[PDB]
Design a protein around this nucleic acid. Sequence first.
RNA 1: CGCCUCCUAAAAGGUAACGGAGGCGCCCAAAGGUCCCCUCAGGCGGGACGGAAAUCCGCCGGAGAGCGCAAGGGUAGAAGG
RNA 2: GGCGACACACGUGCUACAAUGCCCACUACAAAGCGAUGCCACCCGGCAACGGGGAGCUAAUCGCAAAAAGGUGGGCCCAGUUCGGAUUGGGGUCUGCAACCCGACCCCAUGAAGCCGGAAUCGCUAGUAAUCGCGGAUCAGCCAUGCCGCGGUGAAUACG
Lengths: 116, 83, 97, 181, 23, 69
Amino acid sequence: ARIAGVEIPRNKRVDVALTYIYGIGKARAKEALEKTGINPATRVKDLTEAEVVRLREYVENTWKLEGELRAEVAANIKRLMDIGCYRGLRHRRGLPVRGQRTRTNARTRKGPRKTV
Amino acid sequence: PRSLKKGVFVDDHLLEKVLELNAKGEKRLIKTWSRRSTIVPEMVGHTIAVYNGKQHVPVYITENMVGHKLGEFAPTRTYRGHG
Amino acid sequence: TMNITSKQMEITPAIRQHVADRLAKLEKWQTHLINPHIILSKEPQGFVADATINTPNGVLVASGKHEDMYTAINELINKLERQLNKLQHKGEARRAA
Amino acid sequence: PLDVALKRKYYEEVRPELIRRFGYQNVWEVPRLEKVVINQGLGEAKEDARILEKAAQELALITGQKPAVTRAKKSISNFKLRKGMPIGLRVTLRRDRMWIFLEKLLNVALPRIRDFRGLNPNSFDGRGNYNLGLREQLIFPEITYDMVDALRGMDIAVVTTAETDEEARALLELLGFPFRK
Amino acid sequence: GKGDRRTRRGKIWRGTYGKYRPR
Amino acid sequence: MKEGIHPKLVPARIICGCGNVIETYSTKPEIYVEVCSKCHPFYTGQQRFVDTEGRVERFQRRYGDSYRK
RNA sequence: CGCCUCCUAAAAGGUAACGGAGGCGCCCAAAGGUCCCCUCAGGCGGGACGGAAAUCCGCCGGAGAGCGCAAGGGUAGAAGG
RNA sequence: GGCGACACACGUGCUACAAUGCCCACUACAAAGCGAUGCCACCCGGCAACGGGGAGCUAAUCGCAAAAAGGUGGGCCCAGUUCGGAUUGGGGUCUGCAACCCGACCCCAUGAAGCCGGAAUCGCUAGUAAUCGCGGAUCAGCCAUGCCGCGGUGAAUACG
Ligand SMILES: [Mg+2]
Ligand SMILES: [Mg+2]
Ligand SMILES: [Mg+2]
Ligand SMILES: [Mg+2]
Ligand SMILES: [Mg+2]
Ligand SMILES: [Mg+2]
Ligand SMILES: [Mg+2]
Ligand SMILES: [Mg+2]
Ligand SMILES: [Mg+2]
Ligand SMILES: [Mg+2]
Ligand SMILES: [Mg+2]
Ligand SMILES: [Mg+2]
Ligand SMILES: [Mg+2]
Ligand SMILES: [Mg+2]
Ligand SMILES: [Mg+2]
Ligand SMILES: [Mg+2]
Ligand SMILES: [Mg+2]
Ligand SMILES: [Mg+2]
Ligand SMILES: [Mg+2]
Ligand SMILES: [Mg+2]
Ligand SMILES: [Mg+2]
Ligand SMILES: [Mg+2]
Ligand SMILES: [Mg+2]
Ligand SMILES: [Mg+2]
Ligand SMILES: [Mg+2]
Ligand SMILES: [Mg+2]
Ligand SMILES: [Mg+2]
Ligand SMILES: [Mg+2]
Ligand SMILES: [Mg+2]
Ligand SMILES: [Mg+2]
Ligand SMILES: [Mg+2]
Ligand SMILES: [Mg+2]
Ligand SMILES: [Mg+2]
Ligand SMILES: [Mg+2]
Ligand SMILES: [Mg+2]
Ligand SMILES: [Mg+2]
Ligand SMILES: [Mg+2]
Ligand SMILES: [Mg+2]
Ligand SMILES: [Mg+2]
Ligand SMILES: [Mg+2]
Ligand SMILES: [Mg+2]
Ligand SMILES: [Mg+2]
Ligand SMILES: [Mg+2]
Ligand SMILES: [Mg+2]
Ligand SMILES: [Mg+2]
Ligand SMILES: [Mg+2]
Ligand SMILES: [Mg+2]
Ligand SMILES: [Mg+2]
Ligand SMILES: [Zn+2]
């Protein structure tokens, strides 16, 4: 599990690879490679273990990633669900939360169609 | 959400009653139509009845539900499911 | 599936189901009934039952009319059948020469 | 026998603290490690690629000991299981190999465990033994991403001469077993 | 393309501006 | 031990990222690991990596005391 | 309709009825000979996927398991692995 | 408060499933319109939305304004991906008395279905179709992917 908890794609440029971490998108990819002075274009197979632990150390301390991140988002939802607010209710019934129409669509949230 | 440069909005007529009850010691039930008012730290521990268009829903405020709006806790539609 | 509209009228699930069992007679011809649409309506004279149905060999459009909503529906079905039977057999007429 | 840090740590630091904490009157009375038994429940190798020789090669790299096949006591319908079928691996570690395995387990393995919050304090025999289970073999330093085809974990039995969970808790934590609660 | 906000093309289609399409 | 069926155990260095070196025994004499007990957040006191946040919410808003009284 | 097991069968053997219940018409190249080693079912507690039940660990557990197949006898101080 | 509901069903559309493509950076070429508690140059703070300064223009003068496809370079290398941008978490902006139900926008993270679509079915005969962007009415703001316009690039085919 090289970095950071996840084994990022070798053969790929380090900036693109880093996005294969939960919590690290393209924005944060360009950030960590500056702050550690590593060429963003270089492939993960071509990193130095010096650079790896360099890249590793910064990325794992600056931001919340993978497990602990998922834990929070859930707790945040678990919270809204428990305090019983409207946003909460939508999560409890698995319905859309950001005020979308549910007469049609809402399939991403509802899942594939249930016959009647 | 509402600009941080602006206020933390409470309808004053709702808020006033809170502070009034805080001073003398709380609490009687407060019937309000102010769904748009933020739950504010001064309100915690009270039970405010929030009109949802039909009924006034009794809402006991807690430490968890501070940042929210009052309407969020008195749902406006009755839905028990389909079929 | 099948859609039913009750224009400026209220009807029941029962009545809706009745119509579905009545349109079902068209299943006889073993051809695809594509988006059948029934419109129930009330005139001063009686009820009106409209329908538009498409099939691989054409469209069916028919209107039934009668004081009794069920008869209006039955006549709608009768007109739809006659059309469907023509759609399904008219091509056979000129097989010779 | 080999000079190994953990083993040395047991005699030099752990034993005196235990003698202290419970006041044994005999040197033999103090909690000792009897064996570490590793078990791969497998049985995903029942039929199919019943070559679990891949797994045995993995276990052997981890322990330095070649595991022995376990076979079904009886036949079972629902697990799709006939008597005598090769369903798992089991290796009994003692003495120097046992110390070496635990040594790497504490220092390296458990840290590499995903979202590790510490061992489960309640997982004690009641008779002074402890058990923990793993989801992956990748946890161990011997195993790399390259050389592994699929994810198979294991069961680990740590057997102690301690009569109670209390005593066993004392010994294991002293050795460096990291407990959450 | 045009549906992704975090891109130049998306901000054009939507008629807005930002980091991914500045003015 | 039965001969020829076991991997030989040799002296070994396990090298962690934090600079920790572990003198131990293994079937591979040199090994690199991303983490060890010496640096792992759970072990090191309670070194709370990125978030030693402490919620921060929910009265943690305090923006501010400005409503009238 | 021959054969095997139990009961009827009256504590030796034997004992009938169109009396009460079940089996057989095979099988095994080891499921045979011998030497060596090993000991169950089950209950409780513990253990990734793993479940009432797969494999692992501990404790209790004389035989209630096993012994190809009916039943009976026998049997771990082995006939069982 | 509801018209925004949501086991379902149909109609119209938007964005797509990628390399004749996607992303970054630099660089060209329109038309028709709109604009004094309006359109906003330019400056500065902010990654940004935006905010604070501030000139011009009763507008062939000043402003919206940059058109986009394109062009030139660089990256991506056939993968559910640097395709796609749904869903959700968190943080902000602006309008407005007020954005819980029920606004638009920005930023961080999340990164779904979808590998070109059954029966069936729509449009178009030339500056048309296709594809690209620009404006306006309504309008505090906007749920516009709609509507009415505007130009850019620019086909295939018609035996009968
Ligand atoms: Mg990512
Ligand atoms: Mg809605
Ligand atoms: Mg209908
Ligand atoms: Mg009606
Ligand atoms: Mg009706
Ligand atoms: Mg008509
Ligand atoms: Mg008839
Ligand atoms: Mg006719
Ligand atoms: Mg000793
Ligand atoms: Mg316990
Ligand atoms: Mg013990
Ligand atoms: Mg490893
Ligand atoms: Mg994209
Ligand atoms: Mg020898
Ligand atoms: Mg007898
Ligand atoms: Mg007898
Ligand atoms: Mg006798
Ligand atoms: Mg006798
Ligand atoms: Mg005799
Ligand atoms: Mg007879
Ligand atoms: Mg044999
Ligand atoms: Mg033999
Ligand atoms: Mg047992
Ligand atoms: Mg159990
Ligand atoms: Mg389990
Ligand atoms: Mg079990
Ligand atoms: Mg028996
Ligand atoms: Mg309303
Ligand atoms: Mg409406
Ligand atoms: Mg329906
Ligand atoms: Mg459909
Ligand atoms: Mg649309
Ligand atoms: Mg459509
Ligand atoms: Mg492809
Ligand atoms: Mg994906
Ligand atoms: Mg798919
Ligand atoms: Mg992508
Ligand atoms: Mg949010
Ligand atoms: Mg709203
Ligand atoms: Mg197509
Ligand atoms: Mg296409
Ligand atoms: Mg067709
Ligand atoms: Mg024409
Ligand atoms: Mg396009
Ligand atoms: Mg437009
Ligand atoms: Mg306008
Ligand atoms: Mg407008
Ligand atoms: Mg909306
Ligand atoms: Zn370390």
